[PDB]
Structures are given as structure tokens and as C-alpha cells.
């Protein structure tokens, strides 16, 4: 499989490839060293949790022109929850043991 490397012997244009995003030099080390033995910690659940608002009124006749065309793209629905970083949700949680 060490094919003879001479000009015109190995096609270059990779027709089989799909994505060509440019990885920056800064994170080049990011995908080889840092994230190999590390994790952004977790989004764990909670034992005691005990639902967004109504959004029940979406009349189609009174649909503003600027909204009926640009529907939520790439989303199953136009979600309403306000994202927060990992640390935000889990504030002030603790576990304990004795040894």
C-alpha cells in the first residue's frame, strides 16, 4: 500500500469529503492534547424537580409577514427555555460521605 509516489499517480481532489471548515492554529493543540483526558464536567439531573408558559395563541390569519416566512430553522420547535452554562444550573449542590 506504500504506492509509488510520483506525479499524477494519486488523485487529490477528495470527492468523498463533505465538510471543509478551517480549524484554527489556536485549538489545533485543543483537539490533540487538552480534551483527551478532560471533560466540561456534566449536566447531571436532580432528584427533586417538581414547564414553559402557554404559547397557546398563534392565530394564522393575523400572522405578521416578517415571522411567517422565517420559521425556526434546525429546531423541532421554537423552544423558550433560557440556556445557562453548566455552572449556572447546578448552583449549590453537594454530596457527603463518612470514612
Amino acid at each position: 500500500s506504500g504506492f509509488p509516489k510520483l506525479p499524477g499517480f494519486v488523485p487529490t481532489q477528495p470527492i468523498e469529503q463533505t465538510s471543509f471548515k478551517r480549524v484554527s492554529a489556536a485549538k489545533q493543540e485543543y483537539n490533540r492534547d487538552y480534551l483527551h483526558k478532560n471533560v466540561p464536567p456534566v449536566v447531571y439531573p436532580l432528584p427533586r424537580q417538581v414547564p414553559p408558559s402557554q404559547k397557546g395563541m398563534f392565530n394564522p390569519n393575523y400572522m405578521s409577514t416578517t415571522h411567517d416566512t422565517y420559521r425556526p430553522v434546525n429546531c423541532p420547535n421554537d423552544v423558550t427555555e433560557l440556556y445557562q452554562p453548566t455552572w449556572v444550573k447546578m448552583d449549590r449542590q453537594v454530596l457527603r460521605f463518612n470514612a
Binding site: 510520483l6 506525479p7 499524477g8 481532489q13 478551517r22 480549524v23
Partner: protein
């Protein structure tokens, strides 16, 4: 010993780099990790030529990458064989040149010499007995010719006894990529004649001319164009890195191909190349090597080598073969084509034989020649420059960052004179 260190400039400089190391790495048997797996002793015999030893078994290229915009050094290190370039030597600013010969050579380049100049000096201090430098820079690119020439202007200032080599990609007339191509074409050339020991001209117009007619491959790419060139540079210095019959160091190339001080531009090419449909039906004998070497369509330059006369030429045989036919065949070419070779330089072809052939073939040859035809390239570049300057078109971009149009006029006089001087001997007789 007598190793060299490479300086590549500009995006065109970086991409062209991305290949020869790859091919250079291929011949020595250097794996991407840097772990040696060659088969014979020869591949490691002269590893110092393009690598220094580092603890851990993987080999450090003596590469210095320069470019005003970070992207080029970004992609070069992302694809295959991109991890061999070791991060310390990377140098990049924050601005980019925008094809402004002014921007890359006085505005930003002038501000950056410090770090890059520091690193190169150290690497040269590393080598045991320095041989010279090689450079890849883009004349039609503002930054390349801009940053590239200054260092080249700077480098000769401190290494008076080291030969200097420069591969140049001048813009062809047919297909153009930049509108400011004429202006930056002359300015880089003017500074190139006064400092470079050897500069090689390669016309992108020819390559595509070379690819369609010889390689007959349906869909080339800049990788392929890079492929062709990358082989040549390995062609010039190949014999130096391996034992052989007639060792011919790059300096010896300077001895036998520069007639006078100011005519230090040559034209080169690589062969033989076969097709997807002709590789099995051609012939493999010495006559084939000589037949294609002088063929018009193989020279990487837009100038046809028949519109003028060869002042001198050199052929570096690669691989084993009967020297009888190497010397005799040249005697075949010289005699039947006297009119095309000046008559006061008898025996005006250089020959060399190297014992290590390219990976996968039996015979190989690389060609370097200084021909009068090159006047065609400078005139059209010269002719174009006069066309735009009479109307002061696009003059402001260069006038508003420190320059005066007197230098532009000064550049033309030298460039025009070289064109006139270069052609004086064609009508001269003995």
C-alpha cells in the same frame, strides 16, 4: 555536512512548501511521526542536509515559515505531514498584506524583521558548514515579494560568502489572478536582480500547459502544480545528499550556468512524465531522456526556448545509466542545433550523474538552463507596466504609505536595461 536551511514566504510560499518536505520526507523514509523506517543505510547517510536531530528520534525540519496573515501557517499544519513543522519557528503577525508590495515590504514587513531575522540567524548558527539558502516567494503576491525580498535583501547583507537561491513564480500573461500583478511584478524583480545569486522562473501558465498536454489527467489541482515544482527543487540538490559518480553541489551549478554577473535567471523542468494512457507504450532509454529535456513544451516557463539561443545549460542525470550515452547524447544535441546555441561557448552543456534514483523508476533527469528566450517574459511584464503607469492608475495605494513615484521610474530603468543588456550578446558575434 554542508547542509542548508529553507525560508518560505507568502501563502504561495507556504503551500508550495507543504509538498516538497512531504516528497523530501518520502525519499529519506521519514514517517510523519519522525520515526525512521528506511530500508538501506543510504537514506540516513546525509540526513543532516534537511534535518537536525532531536532527542526522541523524530527529525526537525530546518524550516522557517513567514506570512503576514495567520491562515497560511494554519492550514499548512493541519493536513497530512503538517505536524513535522515544529511550533517554535512559526512566525506570523496580525495584519496581512493585501497584495500591496508596499504593505508587505515597508509597512508591516519592516516592523517584523526582528523575530524572523533572529530565528533564521540561530538556525544558520546551528549548521556545521553552511551552504546557502533556498526561498519560495510569490512575486505577484504583495506580501511574498514584499516580506520575501527584504529578508533576501537583508540576508545577503550578513552572509557574504553563502550562495543564494530563489524559486520565483512570476505571473503569466494569459490568465491573471490579480490586477495589481504588473506593479508588484517589476518592484520585486528590480530588487531581485541586485541581491539574488540564482532565481528560477516558473510560469503558472506553463504548468497547466504541462498538465493538460503531458499528464493528460482530467482534473488537476494546485496540489498537482505543487507536486511538479516540489520535485524540481529536490532535483537540483539531489546528488549532493547521496553518493554518486560526479558530485555536483548547488554552488557548482552557479559556476557553470552564470555567464556574467547580471544574468542570473534560469529556467528548469522535471521529466520524464507519463500518461494514464501512454505510461506503458513509451520507451525507457537514454534517448528518451534527452529528447524530452529540450522539448519546448516541457520547460516550466512561458518563454519558448527557441525564440533565442541558449547561453549555457546543465543536465543532472539521476539514477544509474551508461555514461557513454549521457555524454555522447549531449554531443548529439549540441551539433545538430548549433544555430540555436551561441558559437563562442564551445561545449556549453553541463552533465552530472547521481546513483540514487527516484522511488519507483529506473532512470530520471532534471534540467536547468539559462536561455535567451527569457527576454520574452520580462518584456511583456515590462510592456504591461508602462501601460498602467502613464495614466498613474492605482498609483495612490503606493504613494500614500511612504513611497515616491521616482522609485517606480528608477525600477523601470534597471528592468528595461537588463532586458536590453540581456539581448546584447544575441546579436554579438566572434
Amino acid at each position: 555536512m554542508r547542509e542548508i536551511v529553507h525560508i518560505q514566504g507568502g501563502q504561495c510560499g507556504n503551500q508550495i512548501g507543504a509538498k516538497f518536505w512531504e516528497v523530501i520526507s518520502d525519499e529519506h523514509g521519514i514517517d510523519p511521526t519522525g520515526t525512521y523506517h528506511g530500508d538501506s543505510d543510504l537514506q540516513l547517510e546525509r540526513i543532516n542536509v534537511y534535518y537536525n536531530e532531536a532527542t526522541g528520534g523524530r527529525y526537525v525540519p530546518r524550516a522557517i515559515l513567514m506570512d503576514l496573515e495567520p491562515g497560511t501557517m494554519d492550514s499548512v499544519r493541519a493536513g497530512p505531514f503538517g505536524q513535522l513543522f515544529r511550533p517554535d519557528n512559526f512566525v506570523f503577525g496580525q495584519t496581512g498584506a493585501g497584495n500591496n508590495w508596499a504593505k508587505g515590504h515597508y509597512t508591516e514587513g519592516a516592523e517584523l524583521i526582528d523575530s524572523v531575522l533572529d530565528v533564521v540567524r540561530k538556525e544558520a548558527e546551528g549548521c556545521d558548514c553552511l551552504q546557502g539558502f533556498q526561498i519560495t516567494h510569490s512575486l505577484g503576491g504583495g506580501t511574498g515579494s514584499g516580506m520575501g525580498t527584504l529578508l533576501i535583501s537583508k540576508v545577503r547583507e550578513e552572509y557574504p560568502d553563502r550562495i543564494m537561491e530563489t524559486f520565483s513564480v512570476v505571473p503569466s500573461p494569459k490568465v491573471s489572478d490579480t490586477v495589481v500583478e504588473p506593479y508588484n511584478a517589476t518592484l520585486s524583480v528590480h530588487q531581485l536582480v541586485e541581491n539574488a545569486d540564482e532565481c528560477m522562473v516558473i510560469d503558472n501558465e506553463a504548468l497547466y500547459d504541462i498538465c493538460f498536454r503531458t499528464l493528460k489527467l482530467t482534473t488537476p489541482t494546485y496540489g498537482d502544480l505543487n507536486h511538479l515544482v516540489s520535485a524540481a527543487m529536490s532535483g537540483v540538490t539531489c546528488c549532493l545528499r547521496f553518493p554518486g559518480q560526479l558530485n555536483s553541489d548547488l554552488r557548482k551549478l552557479a559556476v557553470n550556468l552564470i555567464p556574467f554577473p547580471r544574468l542570473h535567471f534560469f529556467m528548469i523542468g522535471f521529466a520524464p512524465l507519463t500518461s494514464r494512457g501512454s505510461q506503458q507504450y513509451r520507451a525507457l532509454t537514454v534517448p528518451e531522456l534527452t529528447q524530452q529535456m529540450f522539448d519546448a513544451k516541457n520547460m516550466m516557463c512561458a518563454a519558448d526556448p527557441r525564440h533565442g539561443r541558449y547561453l549555457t545549460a546543465s543536465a543532472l542525470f539521476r539514477g544509474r545509466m551508461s555514461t557513454k550515452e549521457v555524454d555522447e547524447q549531449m554531443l548529439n544535441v549540441q551539433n545538430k542545433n548549433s544555430s540555436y546555441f551561441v558559437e563562442w561557448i564551445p561545449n556549453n552543456i553541463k552533465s552530472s550523474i547521481c546513483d540514487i534514483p527516484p522511488k519507483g523508476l529506473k532512470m530520471a533527469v532534471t534540467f536547468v538552463g539559462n536561455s535567451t528566450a527569457i527576454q520574452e517574459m520580462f518584456k511583456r511584464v515590462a510592456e504591461q507596466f508602462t501601460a498602467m503607469f502613464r495614466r498613474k492608475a492605482f498609483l495612490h495605494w503606493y504613494t500614500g504609505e511612504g513611497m515616491d513615484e521616482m522609485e517606480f521610474t528608477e525600477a523601470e530603468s534597471n528592468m528595461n536595461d537588463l532586458v536590453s543588456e540581456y539581448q546584447q550578446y544575441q546579436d554579438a558575434t566572434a
